[PDB]
């Protein structure tokens, strides 16, 4: 009946990921495909760990559909890793008790801080007289 | 050159500015290239406010 | 206009217009005390204000 719709973005280096929560059963999928097959699948638990920390009883009442755009693969999976957690925090803060919000923030932040606050590092610009941001070309004496 | 630069300096400070600078560089005063410089008042060299406090020519 | 030139080279072409025009009026009006131009470019009209010292000259 009532719209329990929560948009939440989560950002890495350039990759942004917009999670959408609503009322339902426990299905989570990115881009229309579930979490267990998102290549690079070597970092599978780096998507699973908010679900593995909170338990599926927290994600039972909610279904999360996220959009991913920008960056590369590791930045995208860190973006959705952030965005699912922040979306559940915002949903629990706006529609149920915030004591559950406080306990899930506690368990997430004592594990890893990146789940809620973004990594503010972006790529530094190349300067002239060098092949990169700091490094210079090979000096030639004599 | 000395007369002309002090003339434009006195005219430009009586016309009223927070500072002035003129540089005359060339083969004045002999075949060797010399530079004369005539300044007074405050001046800004750095930052952006050279874009909107000093005008150059 | 059916020639329909892009905005990027449009503003560049207007800048080159003001550059060539500034240097042209610099060589023309240096005896008059030429200080610059401002082109108030209307559609269907174009005013072009010369700023100088000896306006009678």
């Amino acid at each position: 009946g009532p719209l329990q719709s929560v948009q939440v973005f989560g950002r890495k280096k350039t990759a942004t990921a917009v999670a959408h929560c609503k009322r339902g059963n426990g299905l989570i999928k990115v881009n229309g495909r579930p979490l267990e097959m998102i290549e690079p699948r070597t970092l599978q638990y780096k998507l699973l760990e908010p679900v593995l920390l909170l338990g599926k009883e927290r994600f039972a009442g909610v279904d999360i559909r996220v959009r991913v755009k920008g960056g590369g693969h590791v930045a995208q999976i860190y973006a959705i890793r952030q965005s699912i957690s922040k979306a559940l925090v915002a949903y629990y803060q706006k529609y149920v008790d915030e004591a559950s919000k406080k306990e899930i923030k506690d368990i997430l932040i004592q594990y890893d801080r990146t789940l809620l606050v973004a990594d503010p590092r972006r790529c530094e610009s190349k300067k002239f007289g060098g092949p990169g941001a700091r490094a210079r070309y090979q000096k030639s004496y004599r | 050159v000395r007369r002309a630069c002090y003339g434009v300096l006195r005219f430009i400070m009586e016309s009223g500015a927070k500072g002035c600078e003129v540089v005359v560089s060339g083969k004045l005063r002999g075949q060797r290239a010399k530079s004369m410089k005539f300044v007074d008042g405050l001046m800004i060299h750095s930052g952006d406010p050279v874009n909107y406090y000093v005008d150059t020519a | 206009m059916a020639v329909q030139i892009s905005k990027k080279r449009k503003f560049v072409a207007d800048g080159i217009f003001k550059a060539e025009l500034n240097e042209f009026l610099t060589r023309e009006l240096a005896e008059d005390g030429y200080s610059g131009v401002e082109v108030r470019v209307t559609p269907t009209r174009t005013e072009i204000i010369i700023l100088a010292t000896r306006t009678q000259n």
Binding site: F128, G129 | - | K7, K8, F11, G15, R40, T42, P43
Partner: protein, 100 residues
Amino acid sequence: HRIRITLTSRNVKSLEKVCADLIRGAKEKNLKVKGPVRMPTKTLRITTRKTPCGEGSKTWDRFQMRIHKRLIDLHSPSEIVKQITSISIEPGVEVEVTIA
């Protein structure tokens, strides 16, 4: 009826002043208006050598021009459009009034 004016400029302050003045005119004449939509800024960037000759430390400039395009939608006959556009335009802003 569905007029659409486009304001290109190089400056930001003058362009914001022009588009805000135009929506003030449309509000005074009490028209339905779409808000001033900002197109992404174009950064024309030229990187040249500072040196006229070849020698030196290899030092480069970054000359850039910025182009800001803000555009407005209004719903009025053409006479209203000519009356509002023919007044109050800053010398740097270039205007393109499309009809459809």
